[PDB]
Amino acid sequence: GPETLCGAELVDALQFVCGDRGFYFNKPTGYGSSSRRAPQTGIVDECCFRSCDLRRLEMYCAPLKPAKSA
């Protein structure tokens, strides 16, 4: 995951941050249709280096961090 690959804790992040059926991969409005910079959540420039952190991708999808919308 982290400290390896580059997009292991990012792709799986949303796949595990949105839940198991919702994670809208930049579905809701993008910025260059994937590719070409990605200054926002660094979902592609996060662990890519050594930052498998989050606190940003939790707003990419899912109705809310914890269960239940509200």
Domains and CATH numbers, the chain: 1-70 (1.10.100.10)
Half-sphere exposure of residue 25, counting CA atoms within 13 Å on the CB side? 9
Place of tokens 């890519």: 48
- Experimental technique behind these coordinates: NMR
Token pair belonging to 63: 């109705």
**What is the distance between the alpha carbons of residues 20 and 34, in angstroms, rounded to a whole number?**
22
Q: Tell me how far the alpha carbon of residue 22 is from its chain's centroid.
A: 12
Token pair belonging to 67: 């269960």
**Residue 5: Cβ-neighbour burial (10 angstroms; 0-12, 13-18, 19+):** middle
Token pair belonging to 66: 């914890």
